[PDB]
Amino acid sequence: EAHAAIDTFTKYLDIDEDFATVLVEEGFSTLEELAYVPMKELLEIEGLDEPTVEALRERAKNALATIAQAQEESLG
């Protein structure tokens, strides 16, 4: 559910739902897209700040690192 993408980012990206939605709203429901997408590309999404987008991505990868920990428990 898209609603889960809002809390997920808030759980990993450490952001608020109103902000996460902007990432999932643009088309980023997976931390990989947020972390895989570069700062500029992510900062261009609209009017994000250099640091806010720079720190948001850092969390994406850092969060994905943990997600990979649970991924090992499941085949997917």
Walk me through the domains of the chain, giving residue ranges and CATH numbers: 1-76 (1.10.150.20)
- DSSP assignment, residue 45? T
Give the integer Cα–Cα distance in Å for 38 and 73. Answer: 29
6, two tokens: 């809002």
Method: NMR
CB atoms within 10 A of CB 32: 14
Q: Cα–chain-centroid distance for residue 60?
A: 5
The answer to whether the beta carbons of residues 7 and 17 sit under 8 Å apart is yes
